[PDB]
Amino acid sequence: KKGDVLYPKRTKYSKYRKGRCSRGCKPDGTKLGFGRYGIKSCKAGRLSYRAIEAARRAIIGHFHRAMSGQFRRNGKIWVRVFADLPITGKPTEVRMGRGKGNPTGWIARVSTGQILFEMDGVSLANARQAATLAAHKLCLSTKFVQWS
Amino acid sequence: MKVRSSVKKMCEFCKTVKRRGRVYVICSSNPKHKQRQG
Amino acid sequence: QLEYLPGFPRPDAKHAETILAVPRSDSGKNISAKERKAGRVPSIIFEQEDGQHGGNKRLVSVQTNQIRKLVTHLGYSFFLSRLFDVEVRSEIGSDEVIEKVRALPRSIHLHSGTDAPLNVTFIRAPPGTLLKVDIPLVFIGDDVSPGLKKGASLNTIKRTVKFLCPAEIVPPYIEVDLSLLDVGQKLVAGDLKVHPALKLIRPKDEPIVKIAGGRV
Amino acid sequence: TRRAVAGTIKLTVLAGKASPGPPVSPALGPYRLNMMAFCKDFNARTQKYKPDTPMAVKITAYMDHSFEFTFKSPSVSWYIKKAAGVDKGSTRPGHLTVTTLSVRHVYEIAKVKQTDPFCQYMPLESICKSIIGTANSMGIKIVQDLE
Amino acid sequence: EAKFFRFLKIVGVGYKARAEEAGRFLYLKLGYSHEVELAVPPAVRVFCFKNNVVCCTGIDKDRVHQFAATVRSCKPPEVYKGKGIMYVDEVVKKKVGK
Amino acid sequence: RRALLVAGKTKINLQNCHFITGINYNGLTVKQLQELRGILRENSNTKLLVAKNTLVFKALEGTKWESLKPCMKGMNAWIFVQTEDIPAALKTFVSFQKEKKLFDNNLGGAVFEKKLYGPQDYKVIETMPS
Amino acid sequence: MLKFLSKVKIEFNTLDPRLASCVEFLAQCNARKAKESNPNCQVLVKRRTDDQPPQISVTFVNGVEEAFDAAATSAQSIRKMILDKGQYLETEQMFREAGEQWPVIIPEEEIHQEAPGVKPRK
RNA sequence: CCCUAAGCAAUCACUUAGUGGAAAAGGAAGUGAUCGAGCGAUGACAACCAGGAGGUGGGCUUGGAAGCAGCCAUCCUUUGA
Ligand SMILES: [Mg+2]
Ligand SMILES: [Mg+2]
Ligand SMILES: [Mg+2]
Ligand SMILES: [Mg+2]
Ligand SMILES: [Zn+2]
């Protein structure tokens, strides 16, 4: 939780592998789990928690502005992607090997087809516009998803 | 003239025109809307 | 008594096309890729009876354009809850009809990124066959409901409900009327109006929809 | 007759008390319009009625400083919040009901609202449904009979 | 026979236009220390009238329209008071000079 | 679907119709137009209807009112006289032109007993009474 | 519309199936915008029983009359060439009012003469 | 093709950027192929012409807010609209 920025409160280990992220898909296809509209990724890659929260804030602000009164709060968002992998880094003027560096942030590994956000309680046009607004905060190619 | 990578129509009087192999946005109403891709 | 009751939705005549298929000589990723390069979706026609030893299976290929058009026009869930006529010919535009069957599309695999069709599965449904079908829900009367007039929001908990259905009277959708719903109370799966020959597979105490309290 | 209409202004003046300065001041002074003949013709019309009736006038202003104005009986808003109750409509109409009126006051106002100069061929059911719409606009509730 | 016509308007205090030699030369006064002289091309002729109005005639539509464009480009209209050279049917949209 | 309206409106309009004509409604204000429609409905029994030219005739095709097809050009209002009293129905529009001074809006063409009479021709039929 | 004309005389047989252009021209020229541009103009309508073809015959401000084939051409085409001929007569006018001879004439060989670009010079 | 030994090789398509012969998000929508969707002689699109109304200045807010600062309602009528 922790309000806006999403990462684990604690982890079993502090320092993780780099891993490989350029591959991976959903082998059975993807369907929305909670909402009527959604954003899924088209590529596989890494998303920082700051980028996920920027996209969520863009969707929330667009729903807050485009709708007013009683339907302003009736738009609901689900965040299906969670940055649970810590990344580390080393400072400048430091030579190569004296152990792993200190953790610097959190990332989420995304596969092809993986649903990132889900939306309900809004119109289709507002869902499309919020999906367009959220895609500019993300370094991966995304697509608008509709329940059918 | 506004020079940017993402040129847009920003009103109903904005037309896209291609001149000398370059994309321009011309506007009969608002001269602030005049753009060149680059 | 194996007919759709009056006042209940029936499958639409507009989407009652015949799905055209040609036989397929093999299975695997190689021939599937070669078929998708030729504009066809690999498929299979089988039946319930001998699930071991295959189901009297016939391997076929269907056109990508027809499958894509049907899935786009109907919707994903509406495609999977509606019977179709499947015609199998020796080649595209021939006359040697190999099989003409009334089958339910049991599953369809769309690509996770591009949503192109990769596989369509048809199960033979002659009259008197009982199939487990996920029927999509259509919610009407939300503009009449007192709960949503007061500014409360709709929590749609389920979009499809699983039913054991005789093949004759599989509903294309179930209309859920929300008009007598004010703030707080909910509908369960037992509140859905169906044919008496349809059986709920999941328990009747499963919430379908709930009008939750709007923020004062 | 042939004049291209320069302007058309609506105007609210209580019945018979048209002293041309507070409501008939800048409203006609903005468009060169004369005051004396307009006021004498207006008070020569709304003399048959009780004073302090918030009567509405539409002035068709012209370029030769000529007048062909139409005087209209007051709004159905005033007719409904005088024949129902308080003179304060709802803050959030359709959420906070203020006063309730059945059908008969609606019928009498519809009898009044047919006497306008351009409503001779409108039927009373039409005006009645319109009055229900105006009532719903204000938070005023509508019923069958109050007891 | 000259079929094509295009009419220019001169707006501005002290601004003048004057044709010289059977329409083969145009002279403008545009607030400078000198006169601006334009040589009228072949198959184009120029005239000036008692409305501070320039007229461009001729038999080639391209040359007449281009010469009218050149004359307008000598002093295109400015946005604050509408002074300069403009087409007769051209609408200039003004803005408030603070 | 908007043509289903016109088909139904003229179907109800032709149930007791004896007479179809047209009025050129150029320049008429909305208040003038509604006033003429209301005058024609209480002083006479005739219903006025503005519609497409191509819909009205298509609901007058294979019908008694079949040969009107040439007189279906221009901004037209269709005056379905649903009574028998044609003289009063024609006299009230003459009174309308005299009183309101609208001489650009004329009666153009008519069909009675399957005969297209000119505006020269259906004037003595206003002159005769009953 | 009516800024070059002084009479619009339109006649058509009422029953003939080619009356569309004439009645549409009556729609164009009897408008509120049209008669506030020339209240001095006359619009004459002649309804006739005989079978002459429909004819729109206008005359201009300088006495020039130019008839039209109303049964074969649309009212927008009639309006377009009325605008063109009226503009041409207005151009010819201030030409004669300012002492210039009309029509202005040039020899038809200066097209083949080379024309260098017009550079304004002091 | 020449430099450079051997084809201005053959057939059907595509591009006109010297792309080919370096470079992403994003923009623009050139030019083809296939499948759809919607509207269309019941006359569509583009163009020209004429209207675009009445309850009503909806209620609140409010120095004023009258279709159009802001909040709530957003119905009805006559209509070709
Ligand atoms: Mg295998
Ligand atoms: Mg060699
Ligand atoms: Mg290169
Ligand atoms: Mg590139
Ligand atoms: Zn613009």
| Strand G55-60 relative to strand G5-13, pairing | antiparallel
Residue C21, Cβ neighbours under 10 Å: how many? 27
Alpha carbon distances (Å) from A98 to A103, C45, D31: 15, 62, 87
- Residue G16 DSSP code: S
Residues around the ion ligand 1 (C-beta < 5 A):
C 28
| Strand D141-142 relative to strand D100-101, pairing | parallel
Give the nucleotide at minimum CA-to-C1' distance from F6.
H80
Instruction: Give me Rg for the CA atoms of chain F.
Output: 14
Strand H nucleotides, any atom under 7 Å to a protein CB? 17, 25-29, 34-37, 41-43, 47-61, 66, 71-81
> Quick one: angle between helices D76-83 and D124-138, nearest 10?
70
Give the nucleotide at minimum CA-to-C1' distance from D54.
H57
H-assigned helices in chain D: 36-43, 76-83, 104-112, 124-138
Which residue is it, tokens 């580390």? A88
- Residue A109 DSSP code: E
Give B26's strand partners: B15
Residue D10, Cβ neighbours under 10 Å: how many? 12
Whether residue E63 contacts residue E43, with contact meaning beta carbons closer than 8 Å, is answered with yes
Q: Provide the strand spans (E) within G18-113.
A: 43-48, 55-60, 65-69
What is the C-alpha to C-alpha distance for residues C201 and C206, in angstroms, rounded to an integer? Answer: 11
Are chains C and A in touch, 3+ Cβ pairs below 8 Å?
A: yes
Which residue is it, tokens 């806006």? A4
- Whether chain F has a CB inside 8 Å of the CB on D2: the answer is no
Which residue is it, tokens 């000259």? E2
For residue F101, give how far its alpha carbon lies from the nearest alpha carbon of chain D (Å): 10
Angle (CA) E9-E10-E14 rounded to 5° is 160
* Residue E72 token pair: 């307008």
| Strand C18-23 relative to strand C84-89, pairing | parallel
Alpha carbon distances (Å) from E79 to A144, B31, E13, E76, E97: 46, 12, 16, 10, 9
Q: What three-state secondary structure class fits A142?
A: strand
Q: How were these coordinates obtained? A: cryo-EM
CA→C1' distance for C42 and H17 (Å): 40
What is the C-alpha to C-alpha distance for residues G50 and G11, in angstroms, rounded to an integer? Answer: 11
Amino acid, single-letter form, for residue C78: F
